[model samples]
Target chain A: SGFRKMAFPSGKVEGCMVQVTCGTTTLNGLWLDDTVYCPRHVICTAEDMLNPNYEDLLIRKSNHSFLVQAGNVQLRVIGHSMQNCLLRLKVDTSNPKTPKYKFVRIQPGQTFSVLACYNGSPSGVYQCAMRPNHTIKGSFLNGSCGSVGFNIDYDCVSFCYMHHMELPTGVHAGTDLEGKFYGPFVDRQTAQAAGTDTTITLNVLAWLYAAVINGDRWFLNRFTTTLNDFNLVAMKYNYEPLTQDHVDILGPLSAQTGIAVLDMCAALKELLQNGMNGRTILGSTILEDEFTPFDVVRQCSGVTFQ
Target chain B: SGFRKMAFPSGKVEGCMVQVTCGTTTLNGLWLDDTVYCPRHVICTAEDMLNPNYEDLLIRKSNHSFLVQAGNVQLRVIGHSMQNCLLRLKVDTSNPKTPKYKFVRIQPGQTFSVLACYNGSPSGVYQCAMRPNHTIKGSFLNGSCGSVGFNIDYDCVSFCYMHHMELPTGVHAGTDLEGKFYGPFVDRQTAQAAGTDTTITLNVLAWLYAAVINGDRWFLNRFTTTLNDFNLVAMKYNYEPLTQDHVDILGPLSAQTGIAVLDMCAALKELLQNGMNGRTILGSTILEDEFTPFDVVRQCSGVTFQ
Candidate 1:
């Protein structure tokens, strides 16, 4: 049986890792019953060592197209929301000056799933998702960690964390820290995930601060202009648009965490016809409004508004 | 005593949560004995969350330039490596047809970090991160999640992922299922996240089919030429790029899984630097040579290859 040739993308090296496949299956190592097949790069990711990319090859080919999904590293063109895209699969040489690659066009919805190495030299990362000047047009839309192939080996990844402010957890309790509240211990996980370790205790002052905030014209303009002009009595402090975490934590504390939301998001939004006229921003735009939205959401003490 | 007014950024509404600041101490709902006060947004990730905007009200003000960070939402302008960017702080009315906004500008290095609410209005998710037709010549480069502020709310973000071919997890020594591997279970979570399910299975002659591919030069041309000519054995089968979850899991799996990354992104990537050459590409020099230095590390990808 002429074993099939397969490669499990790993790092840039000669036969770094290998796998064996036969009769609809991927063998971990060459330790099969009789026949032996080794994939170019055969690695595993824990969960019992599962592998993807299990399909036929011929059906995977296409002309004027190239957006193959080689494992997670799929080669795709950019700005191609329906438009044709380009992909140049080439290698940058050690000569530095002599780069080698092939030009090809990829239509919409075209993708491929195959082994990384083929013939002598197959497609590599530098040819897949590397951004800008990617032969045709497009940038690697996303990235994964531990990527090692040919000239491209991306190991580090920077994730995006949503940061805002939040109150201490475990409150809505009975005890108060002399006007403050210290949540129980071990609650650090939530705190850590939440990015909040301390906050002000809920109180008349807190309510008063909120009312005063919405009362300010600037704050009102930003907030009410978006939501409502606080039509209802200060009965409840509600803002629009709540994230899952918000509901999990604050939904019960008050029918009014909206003060926390600053609903100036959807409701009162006034879509302008033509926005921002100033062409050159020479310096900085000074927020001189008596209500610099900044001052309202933050601040230490609450004051009686005029 | 009135406490420091701080928006916990919990949810939309009032008092479900609260924080107080006194004597430079942030009360977790109620204590101010010795030292206290730590805000939720304090958490940081090396993307240099050094938080460029760490200043007071006046310094945080804008004028010639427009960069405002309200709550988790922030708006700044672009084309500004050194130049300032502006984001109108006005509301785009519902007219949809008529989009009007106030004038403003923000110089480079200018930022704001204040409570989510101020004046009457406060920070709205709408204001956080929305990118559309940008004026003054600049595009939305990279967008941060949880943005809720004024005119510059980039409502879109194309996330990144890393994917590649790999052996199912857990079968370090023994395995088989129709010549396949049925992974154990809960490993289910691991599996599910890895784009796998309860087993290491194969479907159809999907195997015999792999060859039908690369057979196509457009595919073969792009895949081969790169490695062979390069000699540098561009060795690696790292799949494409996957998601944050994969990294969370496989990141520690076997360091062996140098997860090939699909770093391609949809952020502001300019076109036509001489762009793609060809008629199909629509008016651009054609790549007629074997070496189109286009593969040279982005003039920005950090390398000066002669």
Candidate 2:
């Protein structure tokens, strides 16, 4: 009955319209016959519907994560390689019977972990827990916390790895409208700049935008100086850093620069040190010289250089 | 040729998907046979496509604005009734030919005006002009600026009145998930509060959320006291004030209270003065006694009072 409580009752239809789950990569589905039927061919068994245990079943091999079979589409879910990133979730009020189920998007605080089996049965259910004021704790899927009740279970989420999926449906990937995926500073830089001047992180954002979105003269006109330049791009385009949408679009673009992205901040810093000076922009050949890296962007987006 | 530039060439299908116009009530459509074919039943003629003159043809009578025919649906566009509000527009980079035709959502600086005709033919064209840093100037549709060149024409919008429509499509109106519509302060109150303490405005936002979203105990628990309370609602829900989505949902909820909203600040102030004190919430019978007003919400959304 507890498992049954996780699903919407049979034939219980709500809205005439369907939408992506709020702030997460999973498409919201209609529950029927104890199964969740998602739009666009992805279907989940009742046991898997909003099951926290499904997150514990991660098949992380190399950079690849869980493999989902959605009709003819073969989706290879990628792992979020960063450490201690925020786990985004929506407080879903859809199921009135149990409104405690928060829709988890990305698993916080670590890379995708290994899946284990105990005598052919999948190991254990995991809880991606959230405390008030947006504090999150993960890998609770395996550990036995003696007392952890009052905290609501962000339970039964089927597509917990949805944010990591390559070629995620409905999102216009590689397009000009795509948003920023990663944060302003790479993970290492985020640690380094913890008690330091804030200007370096701002510079990194401007440099990344200049490197990736180089050809857009309209945006470039506004990014003339490094004074809150990246914020303008973020505000206008609705790019939230470290979300799944940002990662899918920006991950590829970061690779295109031929700079090793594992230490993206170090690579960007090196590029800036060699090309830029004293926060001066536009006058330097920095934009033109590094133009070759974004050749694919120009080809794909038809955004020609000025 | 000039008018043709306003359209995305006939049968020139780009994306395999459809989305709501960025920050607008109108659904983005594809061009075919000199007309734009939108999803659902809304269609627009090419001459009417991106036509700035269409905004000039507003038929404001009493509180009502324009009337539209979408399939069997008869839509009555409601006027914003506020002065000098923002005219939101997305800088559309879709058109490779002319990237200047911004998609305007709400007409700024005034309410919906009268439709003028000369000899049964539509009168002069208008421009909803925008300056950099989001400064907007409207009702410029009628006057001839002697030198208005270089200012990009946010031109050829078919659905400038889309925001005003009584029932805009695809949005799940009257639902609990719906976002905020109007500003925290009504127009008059905004002027008054400009020189006053900031706490008043923050208090108003909490009051409105408490009033509209009363039944949800989860949200109410967080909003127990008014210390940046409304911002918690705004941040968690992604509610941006003055956007079209906000207005459509919140406008109806505001009207339900039978408060004369022409001076919403005055009405809210009067209510708070009588009922609330020093920003205390929860224990006050204000939530229980005033519970009858949101009966429709409780009925429509199935959101129950605790």
TM-score of chain B of each: 0.14, 0.19
**Candidate 1 chain A, run of 10 with poorest lDDT:** A156-165
Task: Provide the DockQ value for model 2.
Answer: 0.04
By lDDT, who's the top model here?
Answer: 2
lDDT of 2 by residue, B1-306 (tens): 000001111111221112222112234222212122222111223223333222332222222222222223333333222112222112222223222222234321211111111111111112221111112222111111110111112222122221111111111101000111222322111111211111223223334444443332222221133223434433433322223332344455555443322234333334443544334333232322111112223222223123
Q: Compute DockQ for each candidate against the true complex.
A: 0.01, 0.04
For model 2 chain A, the run of ten residues with the poorest summed lDDT: A1-10
Model 2: how far residue B13 lies from native, Å: 9.6
lDDT of 1 by residue, B1-306 (tens): 000111111122111112322122221110011111122111122322233332221143333233222223332322111101111122111212121222122211111111122211222211011011110111011111111111111221111100001223211110110111122212111233223211100100111111111011111111212212222211121112223432233222112222121111110011112222222111112211111111111111221111
Q: Local distance difference test, per candidate?
A: 0.19, 0.24
Best by TM-score: 2
Docking class of 2: incorrect
